[PDB]
Amino acid sequence: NLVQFSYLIQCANHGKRPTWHYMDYGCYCGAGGSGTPVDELDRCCKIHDDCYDEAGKKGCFPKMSAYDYYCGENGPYCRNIKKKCLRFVCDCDVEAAFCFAKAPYNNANWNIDTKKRC
Amino acid sequence: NLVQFSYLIQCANHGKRPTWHYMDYGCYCGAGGSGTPVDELDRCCKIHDDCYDEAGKKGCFPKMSAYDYYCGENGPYCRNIKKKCLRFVCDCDVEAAFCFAKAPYNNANWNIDTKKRC
Numbered sequence: 001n002l003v004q005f006s007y008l009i010q011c012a013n014h015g016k017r018p019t020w021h022y023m024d025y026g027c028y029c030g031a032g033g034s035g036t037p038v039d040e041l042d043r044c045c046k047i048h049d050d051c052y053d054e055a056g057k058k059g060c061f062p063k064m065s066a067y068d069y070y071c072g073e074n075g076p077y078c079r080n081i082k083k084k085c086l087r088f089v090c091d092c093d094v095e096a097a098f099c100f101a102k103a104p105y106n107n108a109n110w111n112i113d114t115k116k117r118c
Numbered sequence: 119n120l121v122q123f124s125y126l127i128q129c130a131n132h133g134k135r136p137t138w139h140y141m142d143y144g145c146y147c148g149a150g151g152s153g154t155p156v157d158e159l160d161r162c163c164k165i166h167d168d169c170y171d172e173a174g175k176k177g178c179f180p181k182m183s184a185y186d187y188y189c190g191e192n193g194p195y196c197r198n199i200k201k202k203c204l205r206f207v208c209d210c211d212v213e214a215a216f217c218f219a220k221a222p223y224n225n226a227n228w229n230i231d232t233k234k235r236c
Contacts, residue, residue, distance in 0.1 A: 016134045107222045 001066055004090075008097035011071035022100055024111045027118035035118030038109050044099035051092035060085035062092060069094070075101070119184055122208075126215035129189035140218055142229045145236035153236030156227050162217035169210035178203035180210060187212070193219070 006019040026042030027035040028049055037043040055062040067090035068079035076097055078090035112118075124137040144160030145153040146167055155161040173180040185208035186197035194215055196208035230236075 014133075104225045106225070 002063055004067060004069065005093040005097070007071065008069065008076040008093050009100055011076040012097040012101040017105065021105070021110070025105075026109050026112065027114060032114070033118075035114075038112070038117070039104070039106055041100065041103040041105060042109065044096055044103055047099070048092060048096040051095070055085075055089050055092060058085065058088065060089055062089045065089050067093075120181055122185060122187065123211040123215070125189065126187065126194040126211050127218055129194040130215040130219040135223065139223070139228070143223075144227050144230065145232060150232070151236075153232075156230070156235070157222070157224055159218065159221040159223060160227065162214055162221055165217070166210060166214040169213070173203075173207050173210060176203065176206065178207055180207045183207050185211075 009019050009022065022029050022041075022045070024030045026038040026045065027033055028037055028042050028045035030045075033046060033049050037046045052062045065086055067083075067086040069076055069090055070079055076094055078087060078094055080087040080090060127137050127140065140147050140159075140163070142148045144156040144163065145151055146155055146160050146163035148163075151164060151167050155164045170180045183204055185201075185204040187194055187208055188197055194212055196205060196212055198205040198208060
């Protein structure tokens with residue numbers, strides 16, 4: 001679920017920005033998304049949206065499902081194996097959390113005019 | 119001293135970027151400095167350099183002197199009163215640590231071509 005995704009993000013970035021900083025960025029980091037992704041970070045979010053759409057079409061409820069994970073000193077990882085829907089959702093979130101942590105955060109792309117730019 | 123300035127910075131930013139990220143940024147964040155400061159963060163560093171130059175001309179050894187400070191939940195602050203050189207140095211560092219924490223960090227301005235741009 002989204003509570004868990006926030007935990008993964010913070011695990012991956014070592015607590016270096018709040019999760020809410022990723023909730024209204026570019027064309028895709030946030031609820032919607034269409035248009036060309038504005039930078040590497042926005043491309044992470046586009047992948048994540050496509051991952052959640054796939055999960056919902058699989059009957060996995062990515063926003064409702066509580067999955068098993070661990071936050072190591074390596075960063076986070078998924079722990080489900082037998083519960084396949086749980087694993088698929090957790091993999092979307094882990095990949096995005098590492099993507100977010102590696103991508104540069106461009107302040108000019110926080111809270112943009114999505115109508116004019118997307 | 120610089121060990122203490124690093125503690126203030128991390129206090130002020132809640133551990134959100136490493137101190138070393140402020141050691142080669144723009145024209146002024148780092149050892150030297152001349153030219154027009156490239157952004158708000160670079161202007162913080164220019165002020166800090168001017169503050170250290172003043173302290174050295176006062177006989178305060180800003181890089182050698184260990185001052186008294188506290189890191190609160192409010193962020194950091196200086197504790198010297200009677201030891202005036204200690205207080206002056208600590209004030210340079212505290213002001214810069216809050217300035218750094220408030221300024222936007224523009225990745226395009228990390229490790230620039232100072233010869234071409236300063």
